[PDB]
mmCIF file with all atom_site columns, C-alpha atoms (C1' of nucleotides) in Angstrom:
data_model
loop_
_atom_site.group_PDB
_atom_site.id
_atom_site.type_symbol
_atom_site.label_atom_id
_atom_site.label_alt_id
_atom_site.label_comp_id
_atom_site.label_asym_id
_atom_site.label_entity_id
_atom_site.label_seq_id
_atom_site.pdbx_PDB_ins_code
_atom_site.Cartn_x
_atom_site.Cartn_y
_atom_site.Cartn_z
_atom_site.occupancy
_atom_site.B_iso_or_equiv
_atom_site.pdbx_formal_charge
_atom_site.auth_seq_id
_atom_site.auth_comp_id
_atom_site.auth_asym_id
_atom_site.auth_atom_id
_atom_site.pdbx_PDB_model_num
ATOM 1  C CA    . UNK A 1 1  ? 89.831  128.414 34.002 1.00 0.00 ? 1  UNK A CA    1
ATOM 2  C CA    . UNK A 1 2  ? 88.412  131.261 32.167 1.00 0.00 ? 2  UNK A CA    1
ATOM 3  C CA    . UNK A 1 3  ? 90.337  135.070 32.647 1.00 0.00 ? 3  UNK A CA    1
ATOM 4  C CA    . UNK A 1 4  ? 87.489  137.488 32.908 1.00 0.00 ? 4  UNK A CA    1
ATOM 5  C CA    . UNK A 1 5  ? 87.723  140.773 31.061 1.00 0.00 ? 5  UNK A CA    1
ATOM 6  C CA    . UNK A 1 6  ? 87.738  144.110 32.444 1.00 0.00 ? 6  UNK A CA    1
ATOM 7  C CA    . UNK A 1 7  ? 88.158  142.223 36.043 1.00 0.00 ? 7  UNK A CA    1
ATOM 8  C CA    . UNK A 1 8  ? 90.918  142.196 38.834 1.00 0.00 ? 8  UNK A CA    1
ATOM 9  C CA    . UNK A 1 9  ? 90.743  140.154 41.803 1.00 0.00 ? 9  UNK A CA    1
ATOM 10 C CA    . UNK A 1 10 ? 91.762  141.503 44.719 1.00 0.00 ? 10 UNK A CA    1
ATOM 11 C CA    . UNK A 1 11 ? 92.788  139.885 48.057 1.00 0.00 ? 11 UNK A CA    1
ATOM 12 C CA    . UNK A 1 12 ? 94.088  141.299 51.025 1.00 0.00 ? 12 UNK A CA    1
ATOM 13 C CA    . UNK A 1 13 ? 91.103  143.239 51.637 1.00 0.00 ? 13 UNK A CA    1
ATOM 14 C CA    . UNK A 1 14 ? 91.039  144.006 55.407 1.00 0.00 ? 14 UNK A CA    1
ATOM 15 C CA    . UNK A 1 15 ? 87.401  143.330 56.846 1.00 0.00 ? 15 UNK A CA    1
ATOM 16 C CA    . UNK A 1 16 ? 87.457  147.821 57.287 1.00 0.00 ? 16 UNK A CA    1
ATOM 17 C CA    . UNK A 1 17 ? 88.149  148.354 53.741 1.00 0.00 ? 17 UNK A CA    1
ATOM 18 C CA    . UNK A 1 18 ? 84.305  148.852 52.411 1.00 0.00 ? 18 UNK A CA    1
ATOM 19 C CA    . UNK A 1 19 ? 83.126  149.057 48.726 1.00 0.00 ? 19 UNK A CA    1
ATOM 20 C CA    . UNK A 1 20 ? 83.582  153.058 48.979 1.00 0.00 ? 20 UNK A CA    1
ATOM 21 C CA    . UNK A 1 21 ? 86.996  152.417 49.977 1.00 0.00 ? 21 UNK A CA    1
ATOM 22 C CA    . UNK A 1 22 ? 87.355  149.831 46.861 1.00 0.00 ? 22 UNK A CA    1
ATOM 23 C CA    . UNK A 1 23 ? 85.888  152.311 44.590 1.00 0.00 ? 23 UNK A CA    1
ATOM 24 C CA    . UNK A 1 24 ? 87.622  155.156 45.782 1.00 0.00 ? 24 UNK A CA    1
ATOM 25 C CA    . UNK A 1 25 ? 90.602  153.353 44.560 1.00 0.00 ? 25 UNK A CA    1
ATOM 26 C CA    . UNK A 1 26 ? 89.641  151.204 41.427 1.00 0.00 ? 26 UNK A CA    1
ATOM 27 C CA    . UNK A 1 27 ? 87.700  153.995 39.972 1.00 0.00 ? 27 UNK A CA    1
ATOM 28 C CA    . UNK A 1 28 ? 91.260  156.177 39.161 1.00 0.00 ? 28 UNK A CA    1
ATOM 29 C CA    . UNK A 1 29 ? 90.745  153.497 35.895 1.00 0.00 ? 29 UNK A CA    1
ATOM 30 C CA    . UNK A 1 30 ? 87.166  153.472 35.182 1.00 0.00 ? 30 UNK A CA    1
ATOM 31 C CA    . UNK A 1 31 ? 83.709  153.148 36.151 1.00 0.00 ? 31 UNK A CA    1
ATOM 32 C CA    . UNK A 1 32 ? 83.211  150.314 38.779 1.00 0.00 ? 32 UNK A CA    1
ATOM 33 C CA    . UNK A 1 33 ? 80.288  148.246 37.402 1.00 0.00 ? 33 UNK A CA    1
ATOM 34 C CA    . UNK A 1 34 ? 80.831  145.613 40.650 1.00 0.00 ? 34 UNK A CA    1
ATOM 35 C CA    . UNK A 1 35 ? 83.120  145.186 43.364 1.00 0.00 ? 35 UNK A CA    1
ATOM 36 C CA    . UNK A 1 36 ? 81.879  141.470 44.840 1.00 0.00 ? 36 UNK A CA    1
ATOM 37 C CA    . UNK A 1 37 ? 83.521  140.397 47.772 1.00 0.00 ? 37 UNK A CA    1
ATOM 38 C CA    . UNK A 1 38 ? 83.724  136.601 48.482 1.00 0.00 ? 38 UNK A CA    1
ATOM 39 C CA    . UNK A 1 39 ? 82.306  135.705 51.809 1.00 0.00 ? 39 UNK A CA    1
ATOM 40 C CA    . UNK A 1 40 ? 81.649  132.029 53.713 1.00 0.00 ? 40 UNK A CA    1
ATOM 41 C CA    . UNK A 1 41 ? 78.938  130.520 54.497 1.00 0.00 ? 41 UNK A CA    1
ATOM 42 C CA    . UNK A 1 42 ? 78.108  132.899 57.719 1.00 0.00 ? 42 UNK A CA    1
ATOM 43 C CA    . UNK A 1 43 ? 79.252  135.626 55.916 1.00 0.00 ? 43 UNK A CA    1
ATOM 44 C CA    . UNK A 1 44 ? 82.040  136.568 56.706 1.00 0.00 ? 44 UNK A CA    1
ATOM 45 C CA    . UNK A 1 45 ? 84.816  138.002 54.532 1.00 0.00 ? 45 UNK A CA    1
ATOM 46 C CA    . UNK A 1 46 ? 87.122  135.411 53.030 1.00 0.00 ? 46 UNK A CA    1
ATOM 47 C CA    . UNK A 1 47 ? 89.630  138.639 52.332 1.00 0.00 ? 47 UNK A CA    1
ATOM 48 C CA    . UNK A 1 48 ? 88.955  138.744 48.622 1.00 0.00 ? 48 UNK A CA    1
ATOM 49 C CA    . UNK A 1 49 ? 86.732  139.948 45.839 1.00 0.00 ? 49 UNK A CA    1
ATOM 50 C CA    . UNK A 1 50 ? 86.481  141.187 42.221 1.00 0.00 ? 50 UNK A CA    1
ATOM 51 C CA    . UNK A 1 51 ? 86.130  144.471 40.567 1.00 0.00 ? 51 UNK A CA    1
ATOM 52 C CA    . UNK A 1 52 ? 84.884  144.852 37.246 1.00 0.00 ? 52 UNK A CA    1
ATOM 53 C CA    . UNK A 1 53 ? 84.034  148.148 35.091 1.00 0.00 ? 53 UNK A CA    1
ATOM 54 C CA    . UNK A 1 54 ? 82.013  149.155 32.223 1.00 0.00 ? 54 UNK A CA    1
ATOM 55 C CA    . UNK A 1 55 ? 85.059  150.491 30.470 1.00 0.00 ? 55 UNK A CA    1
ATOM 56 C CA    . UNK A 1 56 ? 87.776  148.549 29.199 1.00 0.00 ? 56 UNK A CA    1
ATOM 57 C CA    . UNK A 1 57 ? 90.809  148.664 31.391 1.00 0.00 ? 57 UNK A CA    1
ATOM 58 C CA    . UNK A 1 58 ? 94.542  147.402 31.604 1.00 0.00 ? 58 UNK A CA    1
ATOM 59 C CA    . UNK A 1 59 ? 94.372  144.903 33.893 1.00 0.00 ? 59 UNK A CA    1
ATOM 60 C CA    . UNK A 1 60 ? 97.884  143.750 33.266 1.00 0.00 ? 60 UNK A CA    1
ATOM 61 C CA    . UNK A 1 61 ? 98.905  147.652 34.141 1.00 0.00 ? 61 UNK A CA    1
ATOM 62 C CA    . UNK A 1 62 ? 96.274  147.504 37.170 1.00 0.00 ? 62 UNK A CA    1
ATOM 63 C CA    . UNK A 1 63 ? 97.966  144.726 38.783 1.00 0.00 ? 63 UNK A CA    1
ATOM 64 C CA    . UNK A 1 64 ? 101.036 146.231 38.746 1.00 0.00 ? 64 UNK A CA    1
ATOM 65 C CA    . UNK A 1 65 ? 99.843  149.048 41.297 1.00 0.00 ? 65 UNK A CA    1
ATOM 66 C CA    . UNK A 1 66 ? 101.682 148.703 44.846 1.00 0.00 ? 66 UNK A CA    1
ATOM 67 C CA    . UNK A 1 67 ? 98.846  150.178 47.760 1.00 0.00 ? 67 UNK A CA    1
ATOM 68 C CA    . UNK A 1 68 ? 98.532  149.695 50.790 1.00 0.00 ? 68 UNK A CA    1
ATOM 69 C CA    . UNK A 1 69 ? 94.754  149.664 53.148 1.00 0.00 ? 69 UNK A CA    1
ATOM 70 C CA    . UNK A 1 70 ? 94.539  149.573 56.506 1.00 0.00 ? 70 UNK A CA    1
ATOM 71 C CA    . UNK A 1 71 ? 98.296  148.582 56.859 1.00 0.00 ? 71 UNK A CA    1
ATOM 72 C CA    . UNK A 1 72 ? 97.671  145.382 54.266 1.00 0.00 ? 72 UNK A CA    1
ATOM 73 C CA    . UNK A 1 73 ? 99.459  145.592 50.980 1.00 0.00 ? 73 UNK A CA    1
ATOM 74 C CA    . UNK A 1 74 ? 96.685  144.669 48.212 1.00 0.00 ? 74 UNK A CA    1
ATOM 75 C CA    . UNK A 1 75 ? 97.066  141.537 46.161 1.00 0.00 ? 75 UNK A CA    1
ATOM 76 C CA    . UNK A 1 76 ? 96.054  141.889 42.817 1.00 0.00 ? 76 UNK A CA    1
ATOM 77 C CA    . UNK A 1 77 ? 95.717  139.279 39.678 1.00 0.00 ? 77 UNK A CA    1
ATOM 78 C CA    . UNK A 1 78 ? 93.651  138.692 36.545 1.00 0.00 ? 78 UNK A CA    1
ATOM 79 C CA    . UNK A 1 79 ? 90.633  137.146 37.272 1.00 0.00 ? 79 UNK A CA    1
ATOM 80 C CA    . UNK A 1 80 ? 89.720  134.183 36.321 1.00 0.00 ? 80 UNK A CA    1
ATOM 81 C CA    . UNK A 1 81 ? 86.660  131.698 36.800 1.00 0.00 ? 81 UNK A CA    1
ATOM 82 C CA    . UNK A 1 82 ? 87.434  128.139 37.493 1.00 0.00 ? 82 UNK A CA    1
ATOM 83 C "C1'" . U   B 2 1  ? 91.740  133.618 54.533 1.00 0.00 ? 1  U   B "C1'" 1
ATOM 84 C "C1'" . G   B 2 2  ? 94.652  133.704 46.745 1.00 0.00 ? 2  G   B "C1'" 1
ATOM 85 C "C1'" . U   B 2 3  ? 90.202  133.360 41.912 1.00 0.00 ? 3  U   B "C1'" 1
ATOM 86 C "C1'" . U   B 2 4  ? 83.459  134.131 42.086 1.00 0.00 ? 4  U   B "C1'" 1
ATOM 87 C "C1'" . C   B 2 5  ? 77.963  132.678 48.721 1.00 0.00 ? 5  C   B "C1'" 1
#
RNA sequence: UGUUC
């Protein structure tokens, strides 16, 4: 698999939090170019997504950032592309 | 619902 720059997947993203909330968050590092969140076949949120930005960011450091939405703690990695 | 509908 291929790690994605300037990208963090997140999971644990309660079906409430909404890309305003995302943004409102992930933009403290840098301009949100995407926030993407994975879905099934009906549409319905799978609980995880990807944010990427136009700037380059520390996603090592990003990851490291314990928050909590809608009483779920968010789980954050490197993204990468299988 | 853990890595790209």
């Amino acid at each position: 698999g291929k790690i994605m720059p300037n990208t963090v997947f997140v999971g644990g993203i309660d079906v409430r939090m909404d890309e305003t909330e995302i943004r409102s968050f992930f933009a403290r590092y840098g301009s949100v170019k995407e926030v993407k969140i994975i879905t099934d076949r009906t549409g319905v949120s799978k609980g995880y997504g990807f944010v990427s930005f136009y700037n380059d960011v520390d996603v090592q450091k990003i990851v490291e950032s314990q928050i909590n939405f809608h009483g779920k703690k968010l789980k954050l990695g490197p993204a990468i592309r299988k």
